[PDB]
Write a protein that binds this DNA or RNA. Sequence first.
RNA 1: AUGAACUAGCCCUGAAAAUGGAUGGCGCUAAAGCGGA
RNA 2: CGUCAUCUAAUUAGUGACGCGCAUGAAUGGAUUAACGAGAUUCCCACUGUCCCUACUUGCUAUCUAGCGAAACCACAGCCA
RNA 3: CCUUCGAUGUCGGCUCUUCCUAUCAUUGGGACGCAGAAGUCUCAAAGUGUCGGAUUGUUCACCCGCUAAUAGGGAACGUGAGCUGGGUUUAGACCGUCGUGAGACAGGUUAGUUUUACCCUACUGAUGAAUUUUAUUAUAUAUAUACAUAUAGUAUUGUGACAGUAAUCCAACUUGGUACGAGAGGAUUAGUUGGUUCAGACAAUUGGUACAGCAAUUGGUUGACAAACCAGUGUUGCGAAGCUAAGUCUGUUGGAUAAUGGCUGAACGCCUCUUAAGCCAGAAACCAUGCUGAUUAAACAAUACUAUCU
Lengths: 380, 132, 62
Amino acid sequence: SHRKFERPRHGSLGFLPRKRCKRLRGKIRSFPKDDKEKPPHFTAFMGYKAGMTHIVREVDKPGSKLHKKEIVEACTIIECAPMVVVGIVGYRETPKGLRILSTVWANHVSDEFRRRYYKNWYKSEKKAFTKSLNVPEATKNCLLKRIEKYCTVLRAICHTQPSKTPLRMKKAHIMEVQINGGSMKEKLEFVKEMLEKNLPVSTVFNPNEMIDVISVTKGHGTKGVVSRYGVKRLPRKTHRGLRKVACIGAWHPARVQFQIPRHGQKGYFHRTERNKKIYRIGLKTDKNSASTDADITEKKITPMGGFPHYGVVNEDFLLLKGCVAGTKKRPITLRKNIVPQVSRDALAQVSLKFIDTSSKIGHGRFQTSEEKVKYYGPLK
Amino acid sequence: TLKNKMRITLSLPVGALINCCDNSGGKNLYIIAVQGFGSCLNRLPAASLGDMVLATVKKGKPDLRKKVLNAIICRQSKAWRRHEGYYIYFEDNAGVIVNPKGEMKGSAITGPVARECAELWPKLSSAASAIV
Amino acid sequence: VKTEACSFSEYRIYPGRGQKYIARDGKVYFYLSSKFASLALQKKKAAKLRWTQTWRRNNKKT
RNA sequence: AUGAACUAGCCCUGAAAAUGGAUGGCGCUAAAGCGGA
RNA sequence: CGUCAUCUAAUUAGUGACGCGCAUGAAUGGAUUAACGAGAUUCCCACUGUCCCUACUUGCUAUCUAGCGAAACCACAGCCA
RNA sequence: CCUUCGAUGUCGGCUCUUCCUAUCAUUGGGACGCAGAAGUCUCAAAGUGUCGGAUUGUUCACCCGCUAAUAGGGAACGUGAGCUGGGUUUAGACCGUCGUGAGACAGGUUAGUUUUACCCUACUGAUGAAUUUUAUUAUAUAUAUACAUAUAGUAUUGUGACAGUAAUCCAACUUGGUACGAGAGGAUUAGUUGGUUCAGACAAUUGGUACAGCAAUUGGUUGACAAACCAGUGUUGCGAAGCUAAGUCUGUUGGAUAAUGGCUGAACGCCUCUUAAGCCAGAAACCAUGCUGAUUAAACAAUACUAUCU
Ligand SMILES: [Mg+2]
Ligand SMILES: [Mg+2]
Ligand SMILES: [Mg+2]
Ligand SMILES: [Mg+2]
Ligand SMILES: [Mg+2]
Ligand SMILES: [Mg+2]
Ligand SMILES: [Mg+2]
Ligand SMILES: [Mg+2]
Ligand SMILES: [Mg+2]
Ligand SMILES: [Mg+2]
Ligand SMILES: [Mg+2]
Ligand SMILES: [Mg+2]
Ligand SMILES: [Mg+2]
Ligand SMILES: [Mg+2]
Ligand SMILES: [Mg+2]
Ligand SMILES: [Mg+2]
Ligand SMILES: [Mg+2]
Ligand SMILES: [Mg+2]
Ligand SMILES: [Mg+2]
Ligand SMILES: [Mg+2]
Ligand SMILES: [Mg+2]
Ligand SMILES: [Mg+2]
Ligand SMILES: [Mg+2]
Ligand SMILES: [Mg+2]
Ligand SMILES: [Mg+2]
Ligand SMILES: [Mg+2]
Ligand SMILES: [Mg+2]
């Protein structure tokens, strides 16, 4: 007979195999659609997560109850040191999917790029990438000519520089960044000028832009149905315990179905989230990187006492409205939208009035360390 | 009159007994329903400081009792966030008896009243002494 | 940046910190931390606590 | 050089139930279907 | 789920009345009754994680390891429409 | 009365998933005894929803409410080694009617033990080798070649067959006191600002949490001070970091169609959306895009370095 009362299903079946992810790094599944009237440009970047803070902003929404008022919002800080471009790779279309022609490498690579190919570098002779970079340029140009002639997709290989962060790890992270833009010849002439240089973050993104974020959620281990799926907790009188599901299924499909929620592993899942707005792009050469026109105290972004569990941020960075999956130090992949947004929020430009830099250990009360000494006077 | 009312935390579920805050003759209100509440299986309807409710009077003058009446919440004791960046809470829970159209049955509110409520109902803002 | 006093231990409160409270009469109080609000709702007096600004003023210590 | 009224072969409407399913399956229309030689 | 009143916002429940009572009734004891009861029922105040709606936390198990080490049950055996 | 009496646990509720359409609301349409508004009959359609309570053990029923609507059903009358045990249905006891009596009552009432998973599968997560009767959507210098090519080890970056999939509904204001109407009344559509249910995360702020920490204190015991300890956490106040909701953030657009309305146009010198041939527009439905997995393909590619030895 039918269930007495109706209620929507607990889980979502579109994220179903709730297992641990294959890797820490978040991988892009699809790149933005290639428009060939635009000039060639990069489409992605990668950084690390530092912490959160809050800001003060003036609203500009005619019709709202908050039309002309100062509000407070939370934000997330991503440390965004420049990457290095080290190679090129070209794909062509087949009925079996995309297909690699070849890979061309630059003339010199760094030791933190080579560490990613070893399980233990400290005991090795370190002979990776010591013969192949010594090829004549003629072979490379013939290969690039073939790529220009037969390929339809270019991507550029880039890597991060973990020595400029407070991380304990020394291996760099490697990823492929697709290059949209004009014709294949223009794409090739674009990439080659960058083959051993730095990508700063403001070459890829702009202020007030809308971005997508890819990363891996925080891990929690084995969890029960009550926490993993959110099911109704069961009465106090129950004999074998109350944190479970009462009925696993009817008699007679004489099996358990795959839609029934069970115990299992929770967290450490891979996710892609849309529409996170950029509020400010900081620069490591700037003394007042957290001061506004209304607050001329000369400040940096790092709060009094360091970002808790991360360290001090002293490269250039991003400020994102909202929140992002992952722990402190977790690598975050950034991507442009699949097609550009034209709504009112994505076009509106933001002017900030206050960034907060008080301590996040305990309950902080000052914005700088000089205020603290000025308030108490001389101590013992 | 616009009905925008950015969201406010609900803590006053069905079955609560609150003060009456005006000079109509009643002394308390017993909440029995909340207007515009949807469907969710085991969930109790609950209200915040600008909502209209259905209620009865448990002690007060005999012509107001044994009836279903309308009311509007003016003060609440549960903390709620203001978009400027702080949190607020009152002493007690209070409301006034009104028409289905929001017209007062009395003619004077006793204590302070919240600004979010006074923006949605103009007669109440007219009849209040302090708007906080 | 505009700040306000703490009404119990008169510090300065920067935006995004506070906690206000309305008495039975329409007097507004504004505390910043949990500790100060807890002390004020237990009916304790700031003049009776050694670490507050009020005590140091009544003992010629500022 | 049109207008009707009847009659009977194939086809069609009438034709709604619960795990996913059954001309035995694939499939078949110059039949690999129906009535004959 | 007798009719009337009351209790609630809403009462097959509780109490007070009515009585052609399928089939009440006088030591088969009738009608009452202060005090008493780990006896059966209804409402009110106080109180609270019973509940909205769950979260956090301690001991002892469970877990992995060195030793020690049983039983029920068993035609043959274990994917589906 | 076919199967089960060397036993298939016998009412209702709570919990949880899936299926049907004889469609209540939400989407797009046809008709009216259709001015507008409000409704009634009917077509494609199961994508998304279908509640809080008083009385009763209840299924059923009835009333008070909100809502957009509070549709009907199945899965051994779904679901007891999931629970509960109020009713029914052992043994105690009271009442009425019946019986000479022991006793009876599908008539009331009160009190009355709910046992076992470590096996096999199923399902949820977690490690992991082996794979030449095998594979190939090319490789070489416009030319040749399947009469071909292919070792292993460690490691990075990738392709993506196939399977799963996600958003939903409402209000106010403007259009507009306008269209329509004698009056009374009074749309659709589009725009703006908000909200409900659901899903995926997160902790700058607010709250909860305490066997990090600091302080206070009752009884007792070290001769006193100081320092401590015991009372299975002696008892109180605050309480960082971490976890956490009641707190904060985010939640697309294309292809091809169904119902229906049409175009050109014979049959049938007229006509006809085709009940011939040939075409157009078109829905919360379908297929993709997007998202999760991919020892689901005993699947594969490029690259770097190396193997008494190609
Ligand atoms: Mg029990
Ligand atoms: Mg903190
Ligand atoms: Mg200093
Ligand atoms: Mg319930
Ligand atoms: Mg005729
Ligand atoms: Mg046959
Ligand atoms: Mg045959
Ligand atoms: Mg009752
Ligand atoms: Mg008799
Ligand atoms: Mg006698
Ligand atoms: Mg007798
Ligand atoms: Mg042990
Ligand atoms: Mg044996
Ligand atoms: Mg048997
Ligand atoms: Mg048995
Ligand atoms: Mg059985
Ligand atoms: Mg209707
Ligand atoms: Mg009908
Ligand atoms: Mg059954
Ligand atoms: Mg049946
Ligand atoms: Mg049982
Ligand atoms: Mg049962
Ligand atoms: Mg069972
Ligand atoms: Mg019983
Ligand atoms: Mg008995
Ligand atoms: Mg706190
Ligand atoms: Mg805390």
